[PDB]
Structure 1
């Protein structure tokens, strides 16, 4: 069947890896802010690396999660950049998807030489109504099989509205 098992986007999560703290990170942050209006979140290095030049707890990357309408704008807006062509991977078996773009300017946003250019990670997690069952406090449940988001189902969704192309085998 289908009524009420539509296919909203749960959330879009933009992510910027930066093998260091300091200016170059607070600038990545500045990017995500003005782009989301939400103040973004910082992530510390999990262990120390050396060949990557990072230490445990360094503050190494910012990211931000964005939900409803605002999500769809930035999705499409950067989805543009990618000429509406993803790939057959890119989509998870659990039915979410993502892509990267470098140059965060290729989607509105001026230049400002005291900001630099950054690459971004775009990651779009999909769901249907009643996602709450797996997420609220009381009577936490898991969503029924014939309700779970899948790769087939999400690709077909993407191929449709957006009109964009899938690609590869």
Structure 2
């Protein structure tokens, strides 16, 4: 059939909490590990993070890979060791939400859910 299961985003995120040498080192390490330039937190910068996409995200998952209630209802998931990250899945046609000319909502019976994600996890 037409339908699909696909990664949307993987996010590396570290709220270090010492706000200096370790954080600056960590963000450079995260950049070294996956090429994309980091983006950063605030203060009550305390945290470093970056988005990872497609093939590259799958590579990070693959090294990561080697509780069953880790999944969200929307089929997204993450873990740590130590160092940690989180994965969001969305199939094609998600664009309709963002698409500026005609922004709108996806059908409920077309959203990813738990079951498809769980099957994908078993698949890989």
Q: Structure 1 or 2: larger helix share?
A: 2
In the TM superposition, residue 69 of structure 1 has moved relative to its aligned partner by: 0.7
Residue 21, structure 1, aligned to residue 37, structure 2 = no
TM-score when normalising by structure 1: 0.70
Is there any run of 5+ residues in structure 1 with no aligned partner, and where?
46-55, 81-86, 103-118, 163-169
Aligned to 2:101: 138
Aligned to 2:9: 11
Aligned to 1:33: 31
Where do 1:1-169 residues align within 5 Å?
2-3=1-2, 5-45=3-43, 56=44, 59-80=45-66, 87-102=67-82, 119=83, 121-160=84-123, 162=124
Runs ≥4 residues deviating over 6 A: none
3-state DSSP of counterpart to 2:10: strand
Aligned to 1:105: none
In the TM superposition, residue 130 of structure 1 has moved relative to its aligned partner by: 0.2
In the TM superposition, residue 152 of structure 1 has moved relative to its aligned partner by: 1.5
CA radius of gyration, larger in: 1
- After superposition, the C-alpha distances for 1:56-89 in whole angstroms (9 at most, x for unaligned) are 2xx1110110111111111111112xxxxxx322
Q: Please provide the CA RMSD for this pair.
A: 1.1
- After superposition, the C-alpha distances for 1:120-159 in whole angstroms (9 at most, x for unaligned) are x211100111010111212111111221010122111111
In the TM superposition, residue 34 of structure 1 has moved relative to its aligned partner by: 0.3
Number of residue pairs matched by the alignment: 124
Separation (CA, whole Å) in 2 of partners of 1:101 and 1:18: 15
Separation (CA, whole Å) in 2 of partners of 1:136 and 1:31: 34
TM-score when normalising by structure 2: 0.93
3-state DSSP of counterpart to 1:89: coil
